[PDB]
Design a protein around this ligand. Structure first.
Ligand SMILES: CCCCCCCCCCCCCCCCCC(=O)OC[C@H](COP(=O)([O-])OCC(O)COP(=O)([O-])OC[C@@H](COC(=O)CCCCCCCCCCCCCCCCC)OC(=O)CCCCCCCCCCCCCCCCC)OC(=O)CCCCCCCCCCCCCCCCC
Ligand SMILES: CCCCCCCCCCCCCCCCCC(=O)OC[C@H](COP(=O)([O-])OCC(O)COP(=O)([O-])OC[C@@H](COC(=O)CCCCCCCCCCCCCCCCC)OC(=O)CCCCCCCCCCCCCCCCC)OC(=O)CCCCCCCCCCCCCCCCC
Ligand SMILES: CCCCCCCCCCCCCCCCCC(=O)OC[C@H](COP(=O)([O-])OCC[N+](C)(C)C)OC(=O)CCCCCCCCCCCCCCCCC
Ligand SMILES: CCCCCCCCCCCCCCCCCC(=O)OC[C@H](COP(=O)([O-])OCC[N+](C)(C)C)OC(=O)CCCCCCCCCCCCCCCCC
Ligand SMILES: CCCCCCCCCCCCCCCCCC(=O)OC[C@H](COP(=O)([O-])OCC[N+](C)(C)C)OC(=O)CCCCCCCCCCCCCCCCC
Ligand code: SF4
Lengths: 71, 51, 92, 59, 103, 67, 49, 284, 153, 162, 64, 120, 142, 58, 132, 58
């Protein structure tokens, strides 16, 4: 095995955990942040809907289900 | 030789700065033409605002 | 033999100190970020970093909640007699 | 997160200071005071004037 | 500005002279006139300056400017109107200005 | 030397358009500066002051709005 | 002593009166009293906490 | 009934919150202390390289706990106050110095708007903290009643005059671009290229500024071991001396952060290394 | 207190409290400047003491005689008769709910305002209106430097 | 009895620290001083064992007498020993310090530095090589590590010290 | 470059207060336990603003 | 500038100092201090000090502090134009350059008169 | 890029790297350019601060000028015995010239797509400003 | 290098100025409704104070 | 009238694009010869008109809710920087102008355009943002 | 417990009184004069804020 292969292995073992830790300051708690972001979204009952609606609420539901918008 | 080359090198840098300032002017004209596309209306000051 | 070059081996002695320094610094920065990120669900930009119009929009709702409702719902007997009331927005 | 990169730079500026401590000699207070008050203030002010002139040229 | 120029003039007064008094070698004679001049000029300038600044601040408060014409017009119009009836403040402003100039 | 150079270039800049003439010779102040320094100014008689768009009516581009 | 008792009574009444007028007879739209006001998420500008 | 006992708990229910805030700060403090400790060890190791030796190798395994051992020993050492000195001042100046040095971490920036407080006058705060620490050093030298320490305090006064002028001129020059005292505003201008490109002609002056504010080898006055026995800790030992070098290394770390932020791109990668292959705009 | 070091320390604390008042009254910027300037001055002052009063020993003065002869009655009379505050009320004079002008916001100059710092009034005054006094203070500082050099000579 | 449960472990942590950072006083007389300075440089690194030199006695843990002591210097040595912060240890290096040495029969030399201050360890040579000085310093470090708990207390029926 | 010779040296005159020492000189022990004093040098040093004026080198601390 | 959090953080700093104080007090269990003659006396390179209170410096560089007091004012007056230089005109530019020129002239006069050094 | 899109902040809060979207935008704009290629009024209405031929000449000349400068620099500043540093110097000079020429074409591209903004239809204008291909569906779909 | 860097800084400043023009346009679009709500609330408070003052002083 | 400020701005884009007459009347009423504002009591009635036309502007079609929520999340994460979130806001208003035509718009999305969007303005800093 | 205007006027005059009161040491008088200037500084800032005047900050 070349010496630089071992040196690069050591550098990777140093660098990967540090980069991962820096990427996620809130370790093991990003899921709660995702849940909070999901709850911040407004449903159809939290806004005033236009009476002359081109698409009904159920129609928008099927549109979102079919389009795989994943919102 | 070194001093005359240095003299020649200082000049041209001023020329390049002149050119890049002109390019800045050109970009300003470009963005002005872009932004004034749908802003061509003016509302006059009403007569109740006296002089 | 596949040993390291001699100049590299000498400087490699200081690397664990660098690693522990990085660990401590990452911990410090992460704790600062987490303490800031908890009360505000985001990293809130500094108030002075926004424009004049932005500054009004970010503080309008707080003004309405803290100084408009108690004033529009004010009654003579609502106030505390201990004279320790809420302070004015501008202090004179 | 950005601060990671920041840490790197900080470390560099720590290494440079240690090497300077190991390499350079020591001034006297009067010598550096004379250098600062007779040489460096003028250089700072001239640099400021040059920057102002360049900004007026480009703005 | 002119007071600083006058202080500069007072500073550069000649202190020692070439005379025919040869009895004062190898003995210490204290004059103390230079220090007294500098000290008294300095402190009189300080007192006058602080009181003038005080008067300027209250003139801005009372009128909104230190221009002579605006001040005079405002004071006369207030006398006619009977709007600002705080004789104590006007008396104190006049007194402070006068005492500053006296010092 | 830099001062002489920059003033010479500023005076030579007059061949450009109005927005690109030297700010050393042409003013580009904010609205408060402009209003207070040109209010009742007969040397530069700029006319009435537009309130919603903080500019004088004689200033170019005053009161630009969406069509 | 009696005067100390009177002072303690007046201080306690002041404290309770201030707390009572902060908790009730007061709109509750901003978070001021922790663990007594709601810590929920509000979707409208004016929601009582 | 609960309705008539809720008022009594209005205030005390907020008491734990203050407590937990304190806890948070404590943790931060501990962490920063730790990193400073590491820097100390780093220094020795780096010096070893220049001197071609090994350095700390037997405290712990391969010298991994040298800073811990030093700190614990400094705790263990028993301090004595000489007669002829003011005991109150002798014990109070180190306490003030430690309290001041454990504040620099609030004047720090790690990414945009990530600081613990929303301070705007970062440079003004840095000047205030530096002059307070200089006050502490000078008063220590004065109250120690030692001739060497008091000469070092005079040297510290000379140094602070010089650094006041020199750093004031540097800050004057730097404000002309950012138009602000906050740390996060320089990075938006340094995203493309670093400010050392503009300040290339005064790179030596910038490095002198760094050394002077840090009190490095050319400007190691007030701590010189040749002209003086020790700079200002001649009569100080134990944890007062530990507090003084803790403050010195805090100054090192945070001024290095300041220089890196305001002149070397802050938290941005060296994009200028590919400056010849970068497009100004992308449209389509 | 007659010890020079303690006088200097108490004046430093007074400067801190002045800055605290400016902070409370919401002139934050002027707290940042004042302090640093005076801080430098205080530093220099300490050095002056090291040259002129190395120990805290001072003149043995008795403050009681002048206090009971002149200063106490003059102070009492001045306090009795001096008040140049025509009309101004404490914040508790009227209920806070009767004030509404701090709530008003005008958004039309909000988007017409391009200022991003708090140096605008100072810039206006020093370089537009009071520029004559700015030049005067510069000339005053130059003349003061010349006079200081001549005083040293 | 129960206090020992906390004291006995912590003792080690107290010793280890003071064994890991053993700072001697920068003080050298005559030519054992030159030999000591050789023992400090990179060939024999005391900094490996956490030994770094401090110039003032208030920050010093070990006094290292490394040269001839004259009658003119004895009060100064006594004062320097007294002005060091406790706990402190004293190392006597070389013949001139251990005894009179090559000047034992002189009229102006103290016949051993232990007539003025207590001595913890003696290094015999003239000069003792940097090898021997490092040996003596390591021996002193081990001794002071073990010196906090030498079994002075007796064990009761519960195997607990006093 | 003007003359600064008067700022450089200060003589003494009999019974002249302004020409005498108007300050308490800093008499320091450049004593044996000093890094720059080598081993046994006890130099009595008179300093006035960190300027060496008077020397009194005490030797014999290593006279054997 | 700051906010009300700064006082609370200073109090937290004091509590942290209390933690260090507790550690230092606890460390006293592992050593003894024996009273001796010169132990609590001033250290002067191994011998006895000859002075306690009258330790006076010459302060032969006061002109530097005198000039620092003035140039701090110079720079604090210089800040506003640099902060708002984007809105400069003829008057602002002329005033700023004249101020800088006055500073340079004052420094040149000081250099000519040689008040920037140490004097006897 | 140094400045990003002239009409929007590129990666302000979220990073989108969608090659399909940019390919669709490029195809739609190429289709628009080709469709209106033969109408003389539209050709004469096109304005740009710099012509195309001068941009091409600048890109062709700047790297060559830099290479000539570097060759002269090594010839009368560097010892001809060595080979590495001279090659590095020519590489740097040629790269600087290429940077200048690329700057010329980039400024030309910016001027072309921001001076004729009013000529584009509403859907094309929206797609250009927002960088979204879903606005001008019919241009790239068929 | 100093001249070129100053020119570059001016370039970024001008780009920011263009973006600021766009943001100012968006804020202008948003302004009138904010102004209307602000004025309505201000007038409600003023009317409350007017009726209170009239009742007290009549 | 009970909605939050950022929501008010998001709605106000489309509202100003639709409530032009009332806005023009209000602006003409509030004109003055000084940068100092006029007394609001002199223009209350027109102001009310504006508010009225704003109310029906707030009512939205169901198909625009995804765009509205994305704009709201961008606004919350950016702390009210309208330029940084002008894109998503535009996607909202283009829906409100034509709810019927938006469906085909939503059918043109790519794979990445059909993903939940998370805004983190600290990790991603854009290009030379002055307000950051 | 006192209005700021009356408080600061009284503070300035009390500072002058204390300056006169203290024993005539030149350094003490210098320090008290600096304090007097700072009191004027604070009073000018307070009135500048009260009356919306920009000259008092100057
Ligand atoms: C599992 C985690 C520990 C893995 C490991 O190697 O531990 C031993 C590792 C090696 O340190 P050491 O035994 O003191 O060797 C020191 C030698 O002088 C020099 O020893 P070296 O030449 O083998 O240098 C090793 C150094 C070399 O590392 C590098 O060069 C990478 C870059 C370092 C920063 C620049 O790598 C490390 O110290 C390991 C870094 C990755 C593990 C920690 C990640 C967090 O010990 C520590 O890291 C202790 C802390
Ligand atoms: C359970 C605690 C008691 C309780 O009832 O708490 C309720 C209270 C209510 O919160 P929640 O509604 O359940 O959700 C809050 C979550 O934080 C969810 O909110 P989030 O995800 O937005 O918050 C981010 C997350 C981020 O926090 C984390 O990810 C903590 C764990 C990683 C720490 C990494 C940095 C330190 C590295 C040191 C290296 C040496 O949590 C925080 O930022 C909370 C404050 C953390 C302050 C920093 C603590 C550092 C301790 C270091 C100890 C070792 C050195 C001494 O919970 C908390 O305050 C959570 C405390 C978590 C402590 C973790 C310690 C490890
Ligand atoms: C006095 C010498 C010249 C001073 C020049 C200006 C110095 C400016 C400040 C520099 C730092 C040193 C001062 C702080 C420590 C000493 C306190 C002091 O002077 O007390 C005198 C005062 C008065 O001194 P006294 O009690 O000895 O005087 C008795 C009265 N006479 C004068 C008649 C003899 O002390 C007290 O009132 C009791 C002790 C209180 C100490 C409280 C603070 C302790 C330190 C805490 C940490 C520092 C504060 C927080 C951190 C900093 C801010 C973030
Ligand atoms: C000594 C102890 C003094 C305690 C009282 C200090 C003054 C009052 C509290 C500070 C203050 O006014 O903060 C608000 C002001 C800012 O005002 P503000 O706008 O945040 O006020 C809160 C808002 N209202 C008025 C609506 C309630 O804070 C500052 O100006 C910053 C102060 C920094 C202090 C730095 C340390 C000084 C030394 C300790
Ligand atoms: C965590 C902090 C723990 C602090 C414990 C008290 C400090 C201490 O041990 O002081 C030793 C001193 C001296 O204790 P001592 O004299 O009994 O013990 C000295 C050590 N031996 C046993 C070897 C003689 O104790 C105190 O000051 C008593 C404090 C109250 C109990
Ligand atoms: S024991 Fe010998 S070698 Fe050592 S210092 Fe004495 S004379 Fe020198």
């Amino acid at each position: 095995l070349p010496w630089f292969v071992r040196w690069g292995t050591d550098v990777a073992l140093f660098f990967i955990p540090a980069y991962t830790f820096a990427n996620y300051p809130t370790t093991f708690f990003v899921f709660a942040a995702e849940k909070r972001r999901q709850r911040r979204r407004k449903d159809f009952s939290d806004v005033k809907l236009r009476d002359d609606a081109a698409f009904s609420v159920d129609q928008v539901k099927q549109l979102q289900t079919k389009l795989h918008l994943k919102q | 030789k070194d001093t005359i080359m240095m003299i020649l090198f200082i000049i041209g840098g001023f020329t390049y700065c002149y050119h890049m300032r002109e390019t800045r002017f050109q970009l300003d004209d470009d963005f002005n033409e872009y932004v004034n596309t749908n802003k061509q209306t003016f509302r006059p000051i009403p007569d109740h605002v006296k002089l | 033999n596949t040993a390291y070059p001699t100049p590299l081996k000498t400087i490699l002695k200081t690397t664990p100190a660098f690693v522990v320094y990085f660990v401590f610094g990452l911990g410090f920065s992460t704790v600062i970020y987490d303490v800031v990120y908890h009360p505000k669900d985001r990293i809130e930009r500094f108030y002075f970093r926004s424009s004049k119009f932005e500054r009004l929009s970010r503080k309008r709702d707080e003004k309405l909640r803290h100084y408009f409702k108690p004033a529009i719902e004010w009654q003579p007997w609502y106030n505390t007699s201990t004279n320790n009331n809420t302070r004015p927005l501008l202090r004179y | 997160m950005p601060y990671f990169v920041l840490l790197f730079k900080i470390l560099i500026f720590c290494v440079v200071a240690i090497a300077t401590r190991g390499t350079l000699p020591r001034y006297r207070f009067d010598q550096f005071t004379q250098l600062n008050w007779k040489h460096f203030i003028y250089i700072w002010l001239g640099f400021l004037v040059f920057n102002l002139c360049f900004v007026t040229f480009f703005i | 500005l002119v007071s600083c120029a006058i202080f500069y003039k007072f500073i550069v007064s000649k202190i020692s002279f070439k005379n025919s008094n040869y009895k004062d070698n190898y003995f210490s004679i204290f004059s103390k006139n230079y220090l007294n001049v500098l000290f008294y000029q300095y402190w009189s300038s300080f007192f006058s300056s602080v009181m003038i600044g005080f008067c300027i601040i209250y003139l801005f408060s009372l009128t909104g400017s230190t221009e002579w014409s605006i001040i005079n017009f405002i004071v006369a119009s207030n006398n006619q109107i009977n709007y600002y009836t705080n004789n104590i403040t006007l008396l104190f402003i006049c007194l402070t200005l006068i005492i500053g100039f006296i010092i | 030397f830099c001062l002489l150079f920059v003033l010479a270039d500023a005076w030579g800049r007059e061949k450009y358009a109005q927005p690109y003439k030297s700010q050393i010779l042409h003013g580009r102040q904010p609205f408060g500066h402009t209003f207070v320094q040109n209010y009742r100014n007969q040397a530069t008689d700029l006319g009435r002051w537009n309130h919603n768009f903080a500019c004088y009516e004689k200033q170019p581009g005053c009161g630009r709005d969406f069509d | 002593g009696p005067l100390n008792i009177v002072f303690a009574g007046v201080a306690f009444l002041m404290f309770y009166e201030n707390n009572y007028k902060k908790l009730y007879l007061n709109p509750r739209y901003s978070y001021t009293m922790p663990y007594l006001q709601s810590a929920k998420i509000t979707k409208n500008l004016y929601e009582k906490l | 009934m609960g309705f008539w006992i809720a008022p009594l708990f209005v205030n005390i229910l907020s008491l734990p919150l203050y407590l937990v805030m304190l806890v948070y700060n404590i943790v931060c403090m501990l962490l920063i202390t730790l990193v400073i400790a590491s820097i100390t060890l780093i220094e020795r190791k780096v010096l070893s390289l220049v001197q071609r030796r090994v350095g700390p190798h037997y405290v712990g395994y391969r010298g991994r706990l040298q800073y811990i051992a030093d700190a614990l020993k400094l705790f263990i050492k028993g301090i004595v106050v000489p007669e002829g000195s003011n005991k109150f001042w002798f014990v109070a100046i180190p306490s003030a110095a430690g309290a001041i040095c454990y504040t620099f971490w609030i004047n720090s920036m790690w990414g945009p708007s990530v600081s613990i407080f929303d301070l705007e006058y970062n440079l003004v705060y840095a000047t205030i903290l530096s002059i307070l620490f200089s006050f502490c050093i000078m008063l220590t030298g004065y109250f120690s009643k030692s001739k060497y320490a008091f000469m070092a305090s005079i040297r510290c006064a000379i140094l602070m005059l010089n650094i006041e002028i020199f750093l004031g001129l540097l800050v004057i020059n730097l404000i002309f671009i950012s138009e602000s005292f906050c740390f996060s505003v320089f990075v938006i201008y340094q995203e493309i290229i670093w400010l050392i490109f503009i300040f290339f002609g005064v790179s030596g002056l910038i490095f002198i500024t760094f050394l002077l504010e840090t009190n490095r080898a050319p400007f190691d006055l007030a701590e010189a071991e040749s002209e003086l026995v020790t700079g200002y800790s001649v009569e100080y030992g134990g944890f007062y001396f530990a507090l003084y070098y803790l403050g010195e290394y805090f100054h090192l770390f945070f001024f290095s952060m300041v220089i890196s932020i305001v002149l070397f791109g802050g938290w941005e990668l060296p994009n200028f290394l590919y400056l010849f292959l970068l497009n100004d705009f992308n449209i389509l | 207190n007659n010890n020079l070091y303690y006088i200097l320390l108490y004046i430093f604390l007074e400067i801190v409290f002045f800055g605290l008042f400016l902070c409370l009254y919401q002139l934050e910027l002027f707290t940042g400047f004042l302090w640093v300037a005076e801080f430098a001055i205080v530093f220099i002052a300490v050095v002056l003491l090291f040259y002129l009063n190395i120990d805290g020993l001072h003149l043995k003065y008795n403050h009681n005689i002048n206090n009971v002869l002149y200063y106490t009655p003059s102070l009492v009379l001045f306090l009795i008769f001096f008040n140049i505050d025509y009309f101004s009320e404490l914040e508790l004079f009227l209920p806070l709910e009767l004030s509404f002008i701090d709530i008003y916001d005008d958004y039309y100059e909000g988007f017409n305002n391009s200022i991003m710092n708090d140096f605008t009034p100072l810039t206006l005054s020093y370089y537009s209106i009071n520029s004559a006094e700015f030049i005067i203070i510069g000339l005053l500082l130059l003349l003061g430097s010349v006079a200081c050099v001549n005083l040293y000579k | 009895m129960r206090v020992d449960y906390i004291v006995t472990p912590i003792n080690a942590v107290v010793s280890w620290a003071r064994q890991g950072s053993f700072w001697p006083l920068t003080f050298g007389l005559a030519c054992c001083a030159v030999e000591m300075m050789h023992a400090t440089v990179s060939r024999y690194d005391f900094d490996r064992f956490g030994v770094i030199f401090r110039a003032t006695p208030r920050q010093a843990d070990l006094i290292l007498v490394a040269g001839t002591l004259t009658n003119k210097m004895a009060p100064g040595l006594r004062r320097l020993y007294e002005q060091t912060l406790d706990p402190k240890w004293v190392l006597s290096m070389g013949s001139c310090a251990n005894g009179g040495g090559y000047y034992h029969y002189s009229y102006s030399v103290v016949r051993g530095c232990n007539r003025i201050i207590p001595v913890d360890i003696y290094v015999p040579g003239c000069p003792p090589t940097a090898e021997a000085l490092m040996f003596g310093v390591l021996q002193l470090q081990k001794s002071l590590y073990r010196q906090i708990n030498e079994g002075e207390k007796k064990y009761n029926k519960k195997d607990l010290t006093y | 470059m003007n003359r600064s010779i008067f700022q450089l040296w200060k003589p003494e005159s009999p019974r002249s207060n302004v020409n005498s020492k108007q300050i308490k000189t800093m008499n320091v022990n450049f004593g044996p336990q000093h890094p720059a004093a080598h081993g046994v040098l006890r130099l009595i040093l008179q300093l006035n603003g960190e300027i060496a004026e008077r020397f009194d080198p005490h030797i014999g601390l290593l006279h054997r | 500038m700051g906010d009300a959090v700064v006082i609370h953080l200073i109090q937290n700093v004091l509590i942290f100092g209390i933690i260090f104080w507790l550690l230092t007090w606890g460390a006293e269990y592992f050593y003894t201090v024996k009273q001796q003659l010169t132990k609590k006396q001033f250290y002067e390179c191994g011998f006895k000090s000859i002075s306690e209170l009258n330790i006076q410096i010459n302060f032969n560089f006061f002109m530097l502090a005198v000039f620092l007091i003035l140039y701090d004012v110079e720079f604090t007056f210089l800040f506003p134009v640099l902060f708002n230089f984007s809105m400069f005109s003829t008057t602002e530019l002329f005033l700023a350059f004249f101020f800088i020129f006055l500073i340079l002239v004052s420094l040149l006069y000081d250099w000519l008169n040689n008040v920037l050094s140490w004097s006897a | 890029t140094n400045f990003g899109s002239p009409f929007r902040n590129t990666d302000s809060g979220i990073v989108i790297r969608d090659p399909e979207n940019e390919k669709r935008l490029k195809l739609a704009f190429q289709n628009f350019w080709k469709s209106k290629q033969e109408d003389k009024e539209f050709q004469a209405q096109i304005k740009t601060a710099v012509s195309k031929d001068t941009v091409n000449f600048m890109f062709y000349a700047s790297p060559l000028f830099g290479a000539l400068l570097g060759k002269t620099y090594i010839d009368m500043f560097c010892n001809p015995r060595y080979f590495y540093f001279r090659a590095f110097t020519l590489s740097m000079f040629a790269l600087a010239g290429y940077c200048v020429g690329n700057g010329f074409r980039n400024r030309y591209e910016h001027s072309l797509y921001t001076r004729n903004y009013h000529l584009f239809p509403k859907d094309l204008q929206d797609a250009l400003v927002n960088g979204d291909a879903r606005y001008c569906i019919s241009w790239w779909k068929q | 290098l100093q001249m070129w860097g100053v020119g570059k800084i001016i370039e970024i400043k001008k780009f920011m100025k263009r973006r600021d023009i766009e943001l100012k346009g968006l804020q202008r679009k948003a302004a009138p409704f904010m102004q209307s709500m602000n004025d309505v609330r201000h007038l409600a408070l003023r009317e409350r104070n007017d009726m209170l003052y009239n009742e007290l002083l009549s | 009238m009970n909605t939050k400020s950022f929501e008010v701005l998001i709605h106000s884009q489309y509202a100003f694009d639709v409530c032009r007459e009332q806005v023009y009347n209000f602006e003409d009423c509030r004109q003055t010869d000084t940068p100092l504002p006029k007394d609001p009591i002199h223009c209350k009635a027109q102001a009310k008109e504006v508010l009225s036309c704003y109310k029906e502007a707030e009512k939205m079609d169901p198909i625009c809710l995804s765009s509205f929520n994305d704009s709201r999340e961008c606004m919350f994460k950016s702390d009210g920087n309208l330029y940084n979130c002008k894109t998503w806001i535009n996607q909202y208003v283009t829906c409100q102008k034509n709810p019927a035509a938006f469906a085909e718009f939503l059918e043109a999305s790519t794979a990445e355009q059909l993903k939940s969007k998370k805004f983190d303005f600290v990790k991603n800093r854009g290009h030379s943002d002055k307000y950051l | 417990m006192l209005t700021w205007i009356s408080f600061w006027s009284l503070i300035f005059w009390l500072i002058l009184i204390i300056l006169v009161l203290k024993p005539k040491n030149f350094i003490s008088i210098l320090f008290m004069s600096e304090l007097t200037w700072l009191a004027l500084y604070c009073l000018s800032l307070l009135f500048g804020a009260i009356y919306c005047d920009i000259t008092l900050l100057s």
